[PDB]
Amino acid sequence: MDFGSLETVVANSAFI
Amino acid sequence: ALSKEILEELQLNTKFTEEELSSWYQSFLKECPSGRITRQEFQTIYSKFFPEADPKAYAQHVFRSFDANSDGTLDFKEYVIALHMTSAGKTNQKLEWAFSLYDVDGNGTISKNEVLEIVTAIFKMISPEDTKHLPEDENTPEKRAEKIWGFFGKKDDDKLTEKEFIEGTLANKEILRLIQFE
Ligand SMILES: [Ca+2]
Ligand SMILES: [Ca+2]
């Protein structure tokens, strides 16, 4: 919702 | 169990339902049975997404922020702690950690050379699009480095120490925005 895309990039990346 | 240990870390990174860190681990684990995440691989993560720019140097900087955290390699545990600081804290204590990322050398004081590195790396993260929209007398890591170093008030023979570093931000509450790696 706000600046949350950063943490989502590092985790969603090492994920998929 | 992992989360259990991390939970022990407590507030330092309590995060959401600490149990979520467990499911994560199993996922990150199976997604990479490497166990020990090296800086090179991590740099692969930032080199595979961040389409806006190329925070390459930045990705390697963060790795050194919690890797050299007295251990050797970035284990999933350390990974969650990173994902936590990346964007989560807002009322708890975390500045202490900021004194590290803003310092790759090691730790003692923040010298113009230390920030210069993080500043240069950040610059890369700033694509031309935005960079081109920069005012005057401020379009280079060397020119901005003087804005942060000057924001504290430390001449040459003045190494910003871990304490003042927190006080320099306690008074002029107008730094949080700039200091933010973002
Ligand atoms: Ca480590
Ligand atoms: Ca230092």
Side-chain angles (χ1 to χ4, degrees):
Chain A
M1 200 182 269
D2 184 33
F3 321 136
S5 182
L6 212 61
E7 177 187 331
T8 308
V9 97
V10 180
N12 193 237
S13 48
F15 276 28
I16 304 305
Chain B
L2 175 122
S3 174
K4 210 77 160 189
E5 220 72 358
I6 316 206
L7 185 54
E8 215 164 53
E9 216 58 58
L10 299 137
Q11 186 179 90
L12 300 192
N13 44 98
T14 262
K15 234 204 163 273
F16 207 65
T17 52
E18 56 287 328
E19 306 303 329
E20 198 274 308
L21 285 51
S22 177
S23 305
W24 183 319
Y25 165 53
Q26 184 149 18
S27 86
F28 153 82
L29 184 285
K30 298 278 162 87
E31 278 297 339
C32 291
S34 182
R36 257 81 287 181
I37 314 173
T38 319
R39 172 192 58 198
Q40 305 152 250
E41 164 165 343
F42 220 123
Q43 148 171 109
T44 321
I45 309 181
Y46 274 55
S47 293
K48 177 166 54 153
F49 270 74
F50 303 69
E52 313 157 310
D54 287 79
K56 298 193 312 199
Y58 187 95
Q60 276 179 313
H61 269 300
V62 97
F63 182 99
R64 227 160 288 237
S65 315
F66 16 87
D67 176 51
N69 77 299
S70 201
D71 152 80
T73 25
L74 240 152
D75 171 46
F76 172 48
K77 158 172 184 254
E78 282 186 21
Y79 204 96
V80 178
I81 301 206
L83 276 273
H84 174 49
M85 287 50 183
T86 309
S87 163
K90 202 207 288 223
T91 283
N92 292 184
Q93 289 158 294
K94 64 197 312 308
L95 304 206
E96 209 174 30
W97 223 254
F99 197 69
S100 307
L101 157 290
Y102 219 151
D103 163 24
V104 292
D105 96 86
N107 239 359
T109 45
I110 281 183
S111 319
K112 213 169 140 198
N113 277 259
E114 256 178 54
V115 306
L116 257 164
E117 303 340 292
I118 328 307
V119 175
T120 294
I122 279 165
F123 222 65
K124 296 274 276 171
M125 191 178 219
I126 307 186
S127 1
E129 305 180 64
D130 305 82
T131 318
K132 188 173 83 176
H133 300 323
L134 285 170
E136 217 285 307
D137 196 63
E138 191 186 357
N139 309 286
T140 74
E142 193 90 88
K143 198 62 39 166
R144 302 196 58 140
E146 181 170 300
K147 297 284 195 284
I148 300 160
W149 186 246
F151 245 127
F152 285 110
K154 299 272 189 199
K155 314 193 265 60
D156 201 78
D157 319 89
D158 294 302
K159 331 94 100 171
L160 173 48
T161 58
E162 46 170 318
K163 25 167 67 276
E164 274 55 82
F165 166 91
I166 308 165
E167 309 208 315
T169 69
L170 175 55
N172 200 17
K173 47 177 60 275
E174 265 75 66
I175 286 179
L176 18 65
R177 55 196 206 159
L178 181 48
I179 187 266
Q180 189 182 151
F181 32 97
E182 199 160 284

Short mmCIF file of all heavy atoms in Angstrom, two decimals, chain B residues 103-152:
data_model
loop_
_atom_site.label_atom_id
_atom_site.label_comp_id
_atom_site.label_asym_id
_atom_site.label_seq_id
_atom_site.Cartn_x
_atom_site.Cartn_y
_atom_site.Cartn_z
N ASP B 103 27.40 2.33 6.90
CA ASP B 103 28.83 2.17 7.19
C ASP B 103 29.33 0.78 6.78
O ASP B 103 29.07 -0.20 7.45
CB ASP B 103 29.02 2.31 8.69
CG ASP B 103 30.36 1.73 9.07
OD1 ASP B 103 31.20 1.69 8.19
OD2 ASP B 103 30.47 1.36 10.21
N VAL B 104 30.03 0.73 5.69
CA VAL B 104 30.55 -0.58 5.21
C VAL B 104 31.93 -0.91 5.80
O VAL B 104 32.22 -2.06 6.09
CB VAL B 104 30.70 -0.51 3.68
CG1 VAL B 104 29.31 -0.44 3.05
CG2 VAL B 104 31.50 0.74 3.31
N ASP B 105 32.75 0.09 5.96
CA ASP B 105 34.11 -0.14 6.52
C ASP B 105 34.06 -1.13 7.69
O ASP B 105 34.64 -2.19 7.64
CB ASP B 105 34.67 1.23 7.01
CG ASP B 105 34.41 1.41 8.53
OD1 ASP B 105 35.25 0.93 9.27
OD2 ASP B 105 33.38 2.01 8.85
N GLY B 106 33.36 -0.74 8.69
CA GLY B 106 33.21 -1.58 9.89
C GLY B 106 32.33 -0.80 10.83
O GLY B 106 31.12 -0.83 10.71
N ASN B 107 32.93 -0.16 11.77
CA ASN B 107 32.14 0.62 12.72
C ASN B 107 32.99 1.32 13.75
O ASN B 107 33.87 0.75 14.36
CB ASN B 107 31.07 -0.24 13.39
CG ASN B 107 29.68 0.38 13.10
OD1 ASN B 107 29.56 1.42 12.43
ND2 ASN B 107 28.62 -0.22 13.57
N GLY B 108 32.69 2.55 13.90
CA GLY B 108 33.40 3.41 14.87
C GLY B 108 32.82 4.81 14.74
O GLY B 108 32.40 5.41 15.70
N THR B 109 32.79 5.25 13.51
CA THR B 109 32.26 6.59 13.18
C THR B 109 31.93 6.62 11.70
O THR B 109 32.43 5.80 10.94
CB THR B 109 33.33 7.63 13.48
OG1 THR B 109 34.53 7.11 12.94
CG2 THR B 109 33.58 7.72 14.98
N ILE B 110 31.06 7.52 11.31
CA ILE B 110 30.70 7.60 9.88
C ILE B 110 31.50 8.71 9.21
O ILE B 110 31.29 9.89 9.48
CB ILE B 110 29.19 7.89 9.76
CG1 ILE B 110 28.41 6.60 9.99
CG2 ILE B 110 28.89 8.40 8.34
CD1 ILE B 110 26.91 6.88 9.79
N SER B 111 32.43 8.32 8.37
CA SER B 111 33.26 9.33 7.68
C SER B 111 32.70 9.65 6.30
O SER B 111 31.94 8.89 5.74
CB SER B 111 34.68 8.75 7.50
OG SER B 111 34.94 8.09 8.73
N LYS B 112 33.09 10.78 5.79
CA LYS B 112 32.60 11.19 4.45
C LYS B 112 32.84 10.09 3.42
O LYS B 112 32.09 9.95 2.47
CB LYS B 112 33.37 12.44 4.02
CG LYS B 112 32.47 13.34 3.17
CD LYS B 112 33.15 14.70 2.99
CE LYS B 112 32.94 15.21 1.56
NZ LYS B 112 33.92 16.28 1.24
N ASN B 113 33.88 9.34 3.62
CA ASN B 113 34.17 8.25 2.65
C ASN B 113 33.16 7.13 2.79
O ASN B 113 32.78 6.52 1.81
CB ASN B 113 35.58 7.70 2.95
CG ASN B 113 36.62 8.60 2.27
OD1 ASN B 113 37.14 8.28 1.22
ND2 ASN B 113 36.94 9.73 2.83
N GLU B 114 32.73 6.89 4.00
CA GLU B 114 31.74 5.81 4.21
C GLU B 114 30.42 6.15 3.52
O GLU B 114 29.92 5.37 2.71
CB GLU B 114 31.48 5.67 5.73
CG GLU B 114 32.21 4.43 6.29
CD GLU B 114 31.98 4.34 7.81
OE1 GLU B 114 30.82 4.34 8.19
OE2 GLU B 114 32.97 4.26 8.50
N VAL B 115 29.89 7.31 3.83
CA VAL B 115 28.62 7.68 3.18
C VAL B 115 28.81 7.78 1.69
O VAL B 115 27.97 7.37 0.92
CB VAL B 115 28.14 9.03 3.74
CG1 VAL B 115 28.07 8.95 5.27
CG2 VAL B 115 29.11 10.13 3.34
N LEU B 116 29.92 8.34 1.30
CA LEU B 116 30.19 8.48 -0.14
C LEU B 116 29.90 7.18 -0.86
O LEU B 116 29.32 7.17 -1.93
CB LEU B 116 31.67 8.83 -0.34
CG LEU B 116 31.80 10.33 -0.63
CD1 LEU B 116 33.25 10.76 -0.42
CD2 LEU B 116 31.40 10.58 -2.09
N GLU B 117 30.31 6.08 -0.26
CA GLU B 117 30.05 4.77 -0.92
C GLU B 117 28.56 4.53 -1.04
O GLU B 117 28.06 4.26 -2.11
CB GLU B 117 30.65 3.65 -0.05
CG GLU B 117 32.16 3.88 0.16
CD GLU B 117 32.71 4.82 -0.92
OE1 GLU B 117 32.74 4.39 -2.06
OE2 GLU B 117 33.06 5.93 -0.54
N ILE B 118 27.87 4.62 0.06
CA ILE B 118 26.41 4.39 0.01
C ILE B 118 25.75 5.41 -0.90
O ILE B 118 24.77 5.12 -1.56
CB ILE B 118 25.83 4.51 1.41
CG1 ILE B 118 26.85 4.04 2.44
CG2 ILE B 118 24.58 3.61 1.51
CD1 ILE B 118 27.36 2.64 2.08
N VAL B 119 26.29 6.60 -0.92
CA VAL B 119 25.70 7.65 -1.78
C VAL B 119 25.90 7.29 -3.24
O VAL B 119 24.99 7.35 -4.03
CB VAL B 119 26.40 8.98 -1.49
CG1 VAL B 119 25.89 10.04 -2.47
CG2 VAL B 119 26.09 9.42 -0.06
N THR B 120 27.11 6.91 -3.57
CA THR B 120 27.39 6.54 -4.97
C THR B 120 26.51 5.37 -5.38
O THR B 120 25.86 5.40 -6.41
CB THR B 120 28.86 6.12 -5.08
OG1 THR B 120 29.60 7.29 -4.81
CG2 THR B 120 29.22 5.75 -6.53
N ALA B 121 26.49 4.36 -4.55
CA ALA B 121 25.66 3.19 -4.87
C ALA B 121 24.22 3.63 -5.08
O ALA B 121 23.58 3.25 -6.05
CB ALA B 121 25.72 2.22 -3.67
N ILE B 122 23.73 4.42 -4.17
CA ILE B 122 22.34 4.90 -4.30
C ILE B 122 22.16 5.59 -5.64
O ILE B 122 21.22 5.32 -6.36
CB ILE B 122 22.07 5.91 -3.18
CG1 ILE B 122 21.74 5.17 -1.89
CG2 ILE B 122 20.86 6.77 -3.58
CD1 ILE B 122 21.85 6.15 -0.72
N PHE B 123 23.07 6.48 -5.97
CA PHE B 123 22.96 7.19 -7.26
C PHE B 123 22.57 6.23 -8.37
O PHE B 123 21.68 6.50 -9.15
CB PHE B 123 24.32 7.82 -7.60
CG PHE B 123 24.10 9.23 -8.15
CD1 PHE B 123 23.57 10.22 -7.35
CD2 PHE B 123 24.43 9.53 -9.46
CE1 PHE B 123 23.36 11.49 -7.85
CE2 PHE B 123 24.22 10.79 -9.96
CZ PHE B 123 23.69 11.77 -9.15
N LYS B 124 23.25 5.11 -8.42
CA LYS B 124 22.92 4.12 -9.48
C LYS B 124 21.45 3.75 -9.38
O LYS B 124 20.75 3.69 -10.37
CB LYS B 124 23.76 2.86 -9.26
CG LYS B 124 25.24 3.20 -9.44
CD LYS B 124 25.60 3.10 -10.92
CE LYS B 124 25.93 1.65 -11.26
NZ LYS B 124 26.07 1.48 -12.74
N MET B 125 21.00 3.51 -8.17
CA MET B 125 19.57 3.15 -7.98
C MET B 125 18.67 4.25 -8.55
O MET B 125 17.52 4.02 -8.83
CB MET B 125 19.30 3.01 -6.48
CG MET B 125 17.93 2.37 -6.26
SD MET B 125 17.42 2.05 -4.56
CE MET B 125 16.61 0.46 -4.86
N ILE B 126 19.22 5.43 -8.68
CA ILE B 126 18.41 6.55 -9.22
C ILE B 126 18.56 6.63 -10.74
O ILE B 126 19.53 7.16 -11.24
CB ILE B 126 18.91 7.86 -8.62
CG1 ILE B 126 18.94 7.76 -7.10
CG2 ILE B 126 17.94 8.99 -9.01
CD1 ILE B 126 19.30 9.12 -6.51
N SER B 127 17.60 6.10 -11.44
CA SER B 127 17.67 6.14 -12.92
C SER B 127 17.79 7.58 -13.42
O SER B 127 17.52 8.52 -12.70
CB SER B 127 16.39 5.51 -13.49
OG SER B 127 15.63 5.18 -12.34
N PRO B 128 18.19 7.71 -14.67
CA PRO B 128 18.35 9.02 -15.30
C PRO B 128 17.06 9.83 -15.26
O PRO B 128 17.08 11.02 -15.00
CB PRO B 128 18.69 8.71 -16.77
CG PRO B 128 18.80 7.16 -16.91
CD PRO B 128 18.50 6.56 -15.53
N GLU B 129 15.97 9.17 -15.52
CA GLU B 129 14.67 9.87 -15.51
C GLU B 129 14.58 10.85 -14.35
O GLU B 129 14.39 12.04 -14.54
CB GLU B 129 13.55 8.83 -15.36
CG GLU B 129 13.69 7.79 -16.48
CD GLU B 129 12.58 6.74 -16.33
OE1 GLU B 129 11.44 7.14 -16.47
OE2 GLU B 129 12.94 5.60 -16.09
N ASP B 130 14.71 10.34 -13.16
CA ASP B 130 14.63 11.23 -11.97
C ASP B 130 15.88 12.09 -11.86
O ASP B 130 15.80 13.29 -11.66
CB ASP B 130 14.53 10.35 -10.71
CG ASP B 130 13.34 9.40 -10.86
OD1 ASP B 130 13.54 8.38 -11.50
OD2 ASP B 130 12.30 9.74 -10.32
N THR B 131 17.02 11.47 -12.00
CA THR B 131 18.29 12.25 -11.90
C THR B 131 18.23 13.50 -12.77
O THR B 131 18.64 14.56 -12.36
CB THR B 131 19.43 11.36 -12.40
OG1 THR B 131 19.18 10.08 -11.84
CG2 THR B 131 20.77 11.80 -11.78
N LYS B 132 17.71 13.35 -13.96
CA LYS B 132 17.61 14.52 -14.87
C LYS B 132 16.75 15.62 -14.26
O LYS B 132 16.88 16.78 -14.60
CB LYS B 132 16.96 14.06 -16.18
CG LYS B 132 17.03 15.20 -17.20
CD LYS B 132 16.56 14.69 -18.56
CE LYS B 132 15.03 14.75 -18.61
NZ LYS B 132 14.54 14.36 -19.96
N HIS B 133 15.89 15.24 -13.35
CA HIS B 133 15.02 16.25 -12.70
C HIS B 133 15.64 16.76 -11.41
O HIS B 133 14.94 17.03 -10.45
CB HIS B 133 13.67 15.59 -12.38
CG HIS B 133 13.02 15.09 -13.67
ND1 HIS B 133 13.08 15.68 -14.77
CD2 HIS B 133 12.27 13.96 -13.90
CE1 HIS B 133 12.46 15.05 -15.67
NE2 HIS B 133 11.90 13.93 -15.21
N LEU B 134 16.94 16.90 -11.41
CA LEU B 134 17.62 17.39 -10.18
C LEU B 134 17.95 18.89 -10.31
O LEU B 134 18.32 19.36 -11.37
CB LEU B 134 18.94 16.62 -10.03
CG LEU B 134 18.64 15.20 -9.54
CD1 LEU B 134 19.91 14.35 -9.62
CD2 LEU B 134 18.17 15.26 -8.08
N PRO B 135 17.81 19.63 -9.22
CA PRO B 135 18.09 21.07 -9.22
C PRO B 135 19.54 21.34 -9.60
O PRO B 135 20.22 20.49 -10.15
CB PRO B 135 17.83 21.53 -7.77
CG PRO B 135 17.44 20.27 -6.94
CD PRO B 135 17.36 19.09 -7.92
N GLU B 136 20.00 22.53 -9.28
CA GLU B 136 21.40 22.88 -9.60
C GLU B 136 22.30 22.70 -8.39
O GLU B 136 21.83 22.56 -7.28
CB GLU B 136 21.44 24.36 -10.02
CG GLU B 136 22.47 24.54 -11.14
CD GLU B 136 23.88 24.48 -10.56
OE1 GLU B 136 24.11 25.23 -9.62
OE2 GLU B 136 24.65 23.69 -11.08
N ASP B 137 23.59 22.69 -8.61
CA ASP B 137 24.53 22.52 -7.48
C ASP B 137 24.20 21.26 -6.69
O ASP B 137 24.40 21.21 -5.49
CB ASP B 137 24.40 23.73 -6.55
CG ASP B 137 25.61 23.78 -5.61
OD1 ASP B 137 26.70 23.94 -6.14
OD2 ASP B 137 25.37 23.66 -4.42
N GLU B 138 23.69 20.27 -7.37
CA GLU B 138 23.34 19.00 -6.68
C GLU B 138 22.96 17.93 -7.68
O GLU B 138 21.80 17.59 -7.82
CB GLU B 138 22.14 19.27 -5.76
CG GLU B 138 21.93 18.06 -4.85
CD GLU B 138 20.64 18.26 -4.05
OE1 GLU B 138 20.05 19.31 -4.22
OE2 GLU B 138 20.32 17.34 -3.31
N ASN B 139 23.94 17.41 -8.37
CA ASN B 139 23.65 16.35 -9.38
C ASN B 139 24.73 15.27 -9.38
O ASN B 139 24.86 14.54 -10.34
CB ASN B 139 23.61 17.01 -10.77
CG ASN B 139 22.68 18.22 -10.73
OD1 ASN B 139 21.48 18.09 -10.70
ND2 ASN B 139 23.20 19.42 -10.73
N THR B 140 25.48 15.19 -8.31
CA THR B 140 26.55 14.15 -8.26
C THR B 140 26.75 13.66 -6.82
O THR B 140 26.54 14.40 -5.88
CB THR B 140 27.85 14.79 -8.76
OG1 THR B 140 28.28 15.63 -7.70
CG2 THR B 140 27.57 15.75 -9.92
N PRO B 141 27.16 12.41 -6.68
CA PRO B 141 27.40 11.83 -5.36
C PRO B 141 28.34 12.70 -4.54
O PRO B 141 28.30 12.69 -3.33
CB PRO B 141 28.05 10.46 -5.64
CG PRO B 141 28.07 10.26 -7.19
CD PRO B 141 27.44 11.52 -7.81
N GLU B 142 29.17 13.43 -5.22
CA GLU B 142 30.12 14.31 -4.50
C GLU B 142 29.43 15.57 -4.04
O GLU B 142 29.76 16.13 -3.02
CB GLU B 142 31.27 14.68 -5.45
CG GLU B 142 32.41 15.31 -4.65
CD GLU B 142 33.36 14.21 -4.19
OE1 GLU B 142 34.26 13.92 -4.96
OE2 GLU B 142 33.14 13.72 -3.09
N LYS B 143 28.47 16.01 -4.81
CA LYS B 143 27.74 17.24 -4.43
C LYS B 143 26.71 16.93 -3.36
O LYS B 143 26.48 17.73 -2.48
CB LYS B 143 27.04 17.81 -5.68
CG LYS B 143 26.67 19.29 -5.44
CD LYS B 143 27.93 20.16 -5.21
CE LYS B 143 29.06 19.69 -6.15
NZ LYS B 143 30.15 20.71 -6.18
N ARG B 144 26.11 15.78 -3.47
CA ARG B 144 25.09 15.42 -2.46
C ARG B 144 25.79 14.98 -1.19
O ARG B 144 25.33 15.26 -0.10
CB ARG B 144 24.25 14.25 -2.99
CG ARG B 144 23.59 14.66 -4.31
CD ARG B 144 22.47 13.67 -4.63
NE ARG B 144 21.49 13.66 -3.51
CZ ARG B 144 20.21 13.60 -3.77
NH1 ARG B 144 19.65 12.43 -3.90
NH2 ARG B 144 19.54 14.71 -3.90
N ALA B 145 26.90 14.30 -1.35
CA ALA B 145 27.63 13.84 -0.17
C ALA B 145 27.89 15.02 0.75
O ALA B 145 28.00 14.87 1.95
CB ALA B 145 28.98 13.25 -0.62
N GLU B 146 28.00 16.18 0.16
CA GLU B 146 28.25 17.38 0.98
C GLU B 146 26.96 17.86 1.63
O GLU B 146 26.98 18.62 2.57
CB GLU B 146 28.79 18.50 0.06
CG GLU B 146 29.08 19.74 0.91
CD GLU B 146 29.85 20.76 0.05
OE1 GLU B 146 30.92 20.39 -0.39
OE2 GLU B 146 29.31 21.84 -0.11
N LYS B 147 25.85 17.40 1.10
CA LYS B 147 24.55 17.83 1.69
C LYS B 147 24.26 17.02 2.95
O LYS B 147 23.69 17.53 3.90
CB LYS B 147 23.44 17.59 0.66
CG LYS B 147 23.69 18.47 -0.57
CD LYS B 147 23.30 19.91 -0.24
CE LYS B 147 23.19 20.71 -1.54
NZ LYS B 147 24.54 21.05 -2.07
N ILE B 148 24.64 15.77 2.93
CA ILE B 148 24.39 14.92 4.12
C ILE B 148 25.44 15.20 5.17
O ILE B 148 25.14 15.35 6.34
CB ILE B 148 24.49 13.47 3.69
CG1 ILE B 148 23.47 13.18 2.60
CG2 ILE B 148 24.20 12.57 4.90
CD1 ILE B 148 23.88 11.92 1.84
N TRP B 149 26.67 15.25 4.74
CA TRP B 149 27.77 15.52 5.68
C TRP B 149 27.61 16.90 6.30
O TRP B 149 27.93 17.13 7.45
CB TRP B 149 29.09 15.46 4.88
CG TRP B 149 30.29 15.58 5.81
CD1 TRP B 149 31.13 16.61 5.81
CD2 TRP B 149 30.66 14.67 6.68
NE1 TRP B 149 32.04 16.27 6.73
CE2 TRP B 149 31.82 15.05 7.34
CE3 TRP B 149 30.07 13.45 6.98
CZ2 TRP B 149 32.37 14.23 8.30
CZ3 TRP B 149 30.63 12.63 7.95
CH2 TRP B 149 31.78 13.02 8.60
N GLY B 150 27.09 17.81 5.51
CA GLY B 150 26.88 19.18 6.02
C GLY B 150 25.61 19.24 6.87
O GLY B 150 25.48 20.08 7.74
N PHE B 151 24.71 18.32 6.62
CA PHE B 151 23.45 18.31 7.40
C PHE B 151 23.75 18.00 8.86
O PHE B 151 22.99 18.35 9.74
CB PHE B 151 22.54 17.21 6.84
CG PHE B 151 21.28 17.85 6.25
CD1 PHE B 151 20.89 17.57 4.95
CD2 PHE B 151 20.51 18.72 7.01
CE1 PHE B 151 19.75 18.15 4.43
CE2 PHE B 151 19.38 19.30 6.48
CZ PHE B 151 19.00 19.01 5.19
N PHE B 152 24.85 17.34 9.09
CA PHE B 152 25.21 16.99 10.49
C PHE B 152 26.09 18.08 11.10
O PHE B 152 25.94 18.43 12.25
CB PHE B 152 25.99 15.67 10.47
CG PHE B 152 25.01 14.51 10.24
CD1 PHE B 152 25.01 13.82 9.04
CD2 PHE B 152 24.11 14.15 11.22
CE1 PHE B 152 24.12 12.78 8.83
CE2 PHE B 152 23.22 13.11 11.01
CZ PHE B 152 23.23 12.43 9.81
#
